[PDB]
Design a protein around this motif. Structure first.
Motif, PDB file in Angstrom:
ATOM      1  N   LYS A  80       0.877  -1.187   0.000  1.00 18.98           N
ATOM      2  CA  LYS A  80       0.000   0.000   0.000  1.00 18.98           C
ATOM      3  C   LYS A  80       0.907   1.228   0.000  1.00 18.98           C
ATOM      4  CE  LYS A  80      -3.674  -0.516   2.586  1.00 18.98           C
ATOM      5  NZ  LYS A  80      -4.870  -0.291   1.744  1.00 18.98           N
ATOM      6  N   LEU A  81       0.583   2.272  -0.749  1.00 21.09           N
ATOM      7  CA  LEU A  81       1.183   3.610  -0.573  1.00 21.09           C
ATOM      8  C   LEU A  81       0.117   4.545  -0.020  1.00 21.09           C
ATOM      9  CD1 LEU A  81       3.188   4.012  -3.893  1.00 21.09           C
ATOM     10  CD2 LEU A  81       3.942   2.897  -1.820  1.00 21.09           C
ATOM     11  N   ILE A  82       0.490   5.334   0.955  1.00 15.63           N
ATOM     12  CA  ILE A  82      -0.349   6.446   1.459  1.00 15.63           C
ATOM     13  C   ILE A  82       0.394   7.724   1.132  1.00 15.63           C
ATOM     14  CG2 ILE A  82      -1.517   7.486   3.378  1.00 15.63           C
ATOM     15  CD1 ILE A  82      -1.917   4.800   4.620  1.00 15.63           C
ATOM     16  N   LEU A  83      -0.194   8.555   0.297  1.00 11.81           N
ATOM     17  CA  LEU A  83       0.426   9.787  -0.227  1.00 11.81           C
ATOM     18  C   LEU A  83      -0.217  10.970   0.458  1.00 11.81           C
ATOM     19  CD1 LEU A  83       0.107   8.789  -3.993  1.00 11.81           C
ATOM     20  CD2 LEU A  83       1.856   8.004  -2.328  1.00 11.81           C
ATOM     21  N   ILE A  84       0.548  11.846   1.072  1.00  9.57           N
ATOM     22  CA  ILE A  84      -0.001  13.020   1.796  1.00  9.57           C
ATOM     23  C   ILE A  84       0.560  14.273   1.140  1.00  9.57           C
ATOM     24  CG2 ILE A  84      -0.339  14.085   4.032  1.00  9.57           C
ATOM     25  CD1 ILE A  84       0.287  11.456   5.347  1.00  9.57           C
ATOM     26  N   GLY A  85      -0.284  15.189   0.704  1.00  9.95           N
ATOM     27  CA  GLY A  85       0.179  16.435   0.081  1.00  9.95           C
ATOM     28  C   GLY A  85       0.992  16.149  -1.171  1.00  9.95           C
ATOM     29  N   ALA A  86       0.601  15.125  -1.924  1.00 10.58           N
ATOM     30  CA  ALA A  86       1.345  14.657  -3.106  1.00 10.58           C
ATOM     31  C   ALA A  86       0.926  15.437  -4.365  1.00 10.58           C
ATOM     32  CB  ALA A  86       1.124  13.184  -3.313  1.00 10.58           C
ATOM     33  N   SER A  87       1.910  15.785  -5.179  1.00 10.18           N
ATOM     34  CA  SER A  87       1.720  16.304  -6.552  1.00 10.18           C
ATOM     35  C   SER A  87       2.779  15.738  -7.482  1.00 10.18           C
ATOM     36  CB  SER A  87       1.791  17.786  -6.574  1.00 10.18           C
ATOM     37  OG  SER A  87       1.779  18.248  -7.915  1.00 10.18           O
ATOM     38  N   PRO A  88       2.389  15.341  -8.699  1.00 15.10           N
ATOM     39  CA  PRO A  88       3.364  14.851  -9.664  1.00 15.10           C
ATOM     40  C   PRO A  88       4.003  16.002 -10.441  1.00 15.10           C
ATOM     41  CG  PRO A  88       1.172  14.721 -10.603  1.00 15.10           C
ATOM     42  CD  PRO A  88       1.004  15.319  -9.216  1.00 15.10           C
ATOM     43  N   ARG A  89       3.465  17.212 -10.293  1.00 17.32           N
ATOM     44  CA  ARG A  89       3.869  18.358 -11.133  1.00 17.32           C
ATOM     45  C   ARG A  89       3.295  19.640 -10.564  1.00 17.32           C
ATOM     46  NH1 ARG A  89       7.920  19.939 -14.594  1.00 17.32           N
ATOM     47  NH2 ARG A  89       7.131  21.261 -16.280  1.00 17.32           N
ATOM     48  N   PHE A  90       4.155  20.603 -10.258  1.00 15.90           N
ATOM     49  CA  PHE A  90       3.761  21.916  -9.676  1.00 15.90           C
ATOM     50  C   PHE A  90       3.480  22.963 -10.750  1.00 15.90           C
ATOM     51  CE2 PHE A  90       6.098  19.599  -6.499  1.00 15.90           C
ATOM     52  CZ  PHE A  90       5.151  19.590  -5.501  1.00 15.90           C
ATOM     53  N   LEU A  91       4.166  22.897 -11.881  1.00 16.52           N
ATOM     54  CA  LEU A  91       4.014  23.915 -12.944  1.00 16.52           C
ATOM     55  C   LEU A  91       2.764  23.667 -13.786  1.00 16.52           C
ATOM     56  CD1 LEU A  91       7.763  24.131 -13.824  1.00 16.52           C
ATOM     57  CD2 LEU A  91       6.404  25.767 -12.475  1.00 16.52           C
ATOM     58  N   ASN A  92       2.062  24.755 -14.075  1.00 17.68           N
ATOM     59  CA  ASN A  92       0.886  24.801 -14.984  1.00 17.68           C
ATOM     60  C   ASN A  92       1.336  24.546 -16.418  1.00 17.68           C
ATOM     61  OD1 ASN A  92      -0.683  25.475 -12.782  1.00 17.68           O
ATOM     62  ND2 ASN A  92      -0.527  27.678 -13.149  1.00 17.68           N
ATOM     63  N   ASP A  93       0.508  23.857 -17.207  1.00 18.37           N
ATOM     64  CA  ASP A  93       0.576  23.901 -18.686  1.00 18.37           C
ATOM     65  C   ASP A  93      -0.858  24.021 -19.224  1.00 18.37           C
ATOM     66  OD1 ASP A  93      -0.355  21.130 -19.301  1.00 18.37           O
ATOM     67  OD2 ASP A  93       1.492  20.569 -18.273  1.00 18.37           O
ATOM     68  N   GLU A  94      -1.032  23.986 -20.551  1.00 14.67           N
ATOM     69  CA  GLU A  94      -2.339  24.268 -21.211  1.00 14.67           C
ATOM     70  C   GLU A  94      -3.424  23.300 -20.711  1.00 14.67           C
ATOM     71  OE1 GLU A  94      -2.285  23.511 -25.585  1.00 14.67           O
ATOM     72  OE2 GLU A  94      -0.734  22.018 -25.122  1.00 14.67           O
ATOM     73  N   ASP A  95      -3.066  22.056 -20.366  1.00 14.82           N
ATOM     74  CA  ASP A  95      -4.011  20.957 -20.021  1.00 14.82           C
ATOM     75  C   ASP A  95      -3.915  20.585 -18.536  1.00 14.82           C
ATOM     76  OD1 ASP A  95      -4.575  20.572 -22.856  1.00 14.82           O
ATOM     77  OD2 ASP A  95      -2.544  19.727 -22.930  1.00 14.82           O
ATOM     78  N   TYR A  96      -2.972  21.156 -17.794  1.00 15.12           N
ATOM     79  CA  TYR A  96      -2.699  20.691 -16.412  1.00 15.12           C
ATOM     80  C   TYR A  96      -2.459  21.889 -15.503  1.00 15.12           C
ATOM     81  CZ  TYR A  96      -0.264  18.456 -12.498  1.00 15.12           C
ATOM     82  OH  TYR A  96       0.091  18.094 -11.223  1.00 15.12           O
ATOM     83  N   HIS A  97      -3.174  21.928 -14.389  1.00 15.06           N
ATOM     84  CA  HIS A  97      -3.048  22.951 -13.330  1.00 15.06           C
ATOM     85  C   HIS A  97      -2.293  22.361 -12.150  1.00 15.06           C
ATOM     86  CE1 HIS A  97      -3.842  26.495 -11.048  1.00 15.06           C
ATOM     87  NE2 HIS A  97      -4.386  25.765 -10.068  1.00 15.06           N
ATOM     88  N   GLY A  98      -1.018  22.739 -12.002  1.00 16.13           N
ATOM     89  CA  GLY A  98      -0.169  22.340 -10.869  1.00 16.13           C
ATOM     90  C   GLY A  98      -0.230  23.335  -9.722  1.00 16.13           C
ATOM     91  N   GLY A  99      -0.609  24.588 -10.004  1.00 12.23           N
ATOM     92  CA  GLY A  99      -0.735  25.659  -9.007  1.00 12.23           C
ATOM     93  C   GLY A  99       0.330  26.743  -9.130  1.00 12.23           C
ATOM     94  N   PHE A 100       1.308  26.594 -10.024  1.00 11.75           N
ATOM     95  CA  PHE A 100       2.444  27.546 -10.132  1.00 11.75           C
ATOM     96  C   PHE A 100       2.737  27.851 -11.599  1.00 11.75           C
ATOM     97  CE2 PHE A 100       3.515  27.335  -5.633  1.00 11.75           C
ATOM     98  CZ  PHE A 100       2.943  26.139  -5.257  1.00 11.75           C
ATOM     99  N   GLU A 101       3.061  29.113 -11.867  1.00  7.60           N
ATOM    100  CA  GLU A 101       3.503  29.588 -13.196  1.00  7.60           C
ATOM    101  C   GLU A 101       5.033  29.590 -13.244  1.00  7.60           C
ATOM    102  OE1 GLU A 101       1.946  30.279 -16.094  1.00  7.60           O
ATOM    103  OE2 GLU A 101       0.019  29.648 -15.240  1.00  7.60           O
ATOM    104  N   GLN A 102       5.576  28.976 -14.294  1.00  5.07           N
ATOM    105  CA  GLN A 102       7.028  28.932 -14.612  1.00  5.07           C
ATOM    106  C   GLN A 102       7.635  30.327 -14.420  1.00  5.07           C
ATOM    107  OE1 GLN A 102      10.008  26.931 -14.936  1.00  5.07           O
ATOM    108  NE2 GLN A 102       8.833  25.940 -16.578  1.00  5.07           N
ATOM    109  N   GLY A 103       6.987  31.360 -14.981  1.00  2.81           N
ATOM    110  CA  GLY A 103       7.494  32.746 -15.000  1.00  2.81           C
ATOM    111  C   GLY A 103       7.731  33.294 -13.603  1.00  2.81           C
ATOM    112  N   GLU A 104       6.974  32.827 -12.610  1.00  2.00           N
ATOM    113  CA  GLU A 104       6.917  33.458 -11.274  1.00  2.00           C
ATOM    114  C   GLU A 104       8.020  32.873 -10.376  1.00  2.00           C
ATOM    115  OE1 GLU A 104       3.190  33.020  -9.157  1.00  2.00           O
ATOM    116  OE2 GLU A 104       3.126  30.857  -9.593  1.00  2.00           O
TER     117      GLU A 104
END
Length: 264
Positions: A113-137
């Motif tokens: 079993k894996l238990i993932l807490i506060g997990a994200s595979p990717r923080f940066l936004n792209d056209e199809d995916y919202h990670g929560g962060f802009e590359q530019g910033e």
């Protein structure tokens, strides 16, 4: 054995089913201190420090080696092999969620079993995916952290803890202040450069995705993304806890949800 000593490997508890608690960015294994009492009666609990933890000799942080998540996976598998662990349940916060995903792809038999807490595979936004962060910033923030580490920690810790839990803000700040600032910046770049979306489908073990409310680093949509893309049997737990560090801010409530997930 020198690895076990270097990364402060600790084995505690009266049980024999193995539970690995793997801390994330900006803490050490002490982040699990308030969880731990809830598992000693019926688990064998394995804790360790990531090489970047403030509680690890900074001499061990080899910038030539730790350039991606793969060398961190090497450390985790070396520890489990050295302890003679052939099967465990694994809890990973933040970056340790991704390290456990990669570990499971390398060693599918090792994790029940894996238990993932506060997990994200990717923080940066792209056209199809919202990670929560802009590359530019992000570069203006890395510059700020390099210029004034204390100001960065003081602005970051309250946003990370999120809920009005001042003791958790002070505690997270303490372990960030133990980290060497150049290691903190290097690890921060490593996690912002990570993109685990490609490999989620390769996971075959069951994943419990623990998602808090108003996690500054993990939009709600990312927990749903993991539920849709992790290759095995997935369960999302929408925790009644605010902020990215529920093991620090709400340990009793988090421990109950972990127990539920481990029983499933």
């Amino acid at each position: 054995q020198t690895l076990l000593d270097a990364l402060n490997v600790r084995v505690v508890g009266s049980g024999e089913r193995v539970l690995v608690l793997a801390h994330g960015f900006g803490t050490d294994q002490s982040a699990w201190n308030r969880i731990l009492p809830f598992f000693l009666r019926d688990y064998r609990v394995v804790l360790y420090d990531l090489v970047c933890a403030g509680s690890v000799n900074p001499d061990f942080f080899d910038f030539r080696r730790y350039t991606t998540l793969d060398p961190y996976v090497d450390d985790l598998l070396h520890i489990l092999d050295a302890l003679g662990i052939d099967q465990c349940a694994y809890v990973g916060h933040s970056v340790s969620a991704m390290i456990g995903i990669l570990a499971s792809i390398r060693r599918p038999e090792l994790f029940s079993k894996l238990i993932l807490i506060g997990a994200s595979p990717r923080f940066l936004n792209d056209e199809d995916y919202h990670g929560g962060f802009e590359q530019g910033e992000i570069e203006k923030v890395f510059s700020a952290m390099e210029a004034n580490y204390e100001a960065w920690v003081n602005g970051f810790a309250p946003l990370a803890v999120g809920a009005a839990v001042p003791a958790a803000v002070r505690e997270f700040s303490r372990t960030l202040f133990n980290m060497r600032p150049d290691i903190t910046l290097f690890v921060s770049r490593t996690v912002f450069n990570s993109d685990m979306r490609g490999v989620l489908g390769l996971v075959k073990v069951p994943c419990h995705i623990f998602q808090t409310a108003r996690d500054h680093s993990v939009p709600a949509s990312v927990a749903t993304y993991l539920k849709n893309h992790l290759g095995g049997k997935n369960t999302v737990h929408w925790l009644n806890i605010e902020g990215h560090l529920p093991h620090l801010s709400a340990p009793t409530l988090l421990a109950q949800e972990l127990r539920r997930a481990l029983s499933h």
